[PDB]
Amino acid sequence: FACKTANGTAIPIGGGSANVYVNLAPVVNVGQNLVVDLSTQIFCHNDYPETITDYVTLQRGSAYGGVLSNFSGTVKYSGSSYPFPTTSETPRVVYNSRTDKPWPVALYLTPVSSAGGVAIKAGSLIAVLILRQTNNYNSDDFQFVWNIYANNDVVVPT
Ligand SMILES: CCCCCCCO[C@H]1O[C@H](CO)[C@@H](F)[C@H](O)[C@@H]1O
Numbered sequence: 001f002a003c004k005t006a007n008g009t010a011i012p013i014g015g016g017s018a019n020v021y022v023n024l025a026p027v028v029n030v031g032q033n034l035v036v037d038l039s040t041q042i043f044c045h046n047d048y049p050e051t052i053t054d055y056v057t058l059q060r061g062s063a064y065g066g067v068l069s070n071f072s073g074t075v076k077y078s079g080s081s082y083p084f085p086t087t088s089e090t091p092r093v094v095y096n097s098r099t100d101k102p103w104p105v106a107l108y109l110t111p112v113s114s115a116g117g118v119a120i121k122a123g124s125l126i127a128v129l130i131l132r133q134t135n136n137y138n139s140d141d142f143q144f145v146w147n148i149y150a151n152n153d154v155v156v157p158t
Contacts, residue, residue: 001054003044003144015142023151036107043100052137054095059132061086066120071109078104111156120154
């Protein structure tokens with residue numbers, strides 16, 4: 001089991017970490033969602049589907065900088081919604097193919113009432129998402145750490 005980003009940055013068997021640079025909607029009004037869809041950014045696969053089933057969860061999702069200060073978050077994992085920053089490990093997603101499958105994580109961020117102006121700064125860390133991988137074969141328990149960065153400023157109109 002290993003993962004890669006849309007630009008080809010890989011995290012090999014055993015886990016590790018990688019940076020993910022995301023383009024964000026430049027203008028987000030109070031009452032609207034800023035959607036950060038990681039399913040177009042992070043892809044994973046099973047290296048031995050003939051014998052092994054891989055189990056994948058979002059173990060933790062943490063908010064940073066402007067996302068932590070200016071937004072009220074929700075994380076959607078494989079069609080179910082949870083608070084973001086996270087309060088528990090999600091259920092598992094099964095990886096049973098050698099063909100790349102997107103990691104089904106999306107952040108839904110709505111401005112808090114005090115937000116206004118430059119709510120997210122270009123180049124800042126916005127989130128850290130922990131992908132946890134286990135299997136039905138051995139004792140492997142690996143973490144694939146995704147450091148999410150904003151490519152641009154996000155303005156919340158006043
Ligand atoms: C004849 C025995 C060969 C065993 C191959 C083991 C390959 O291990 C990797 O891929 C597995 C499937 O994706 C993961 F279960 C592991 O955790 C590990 O990532």
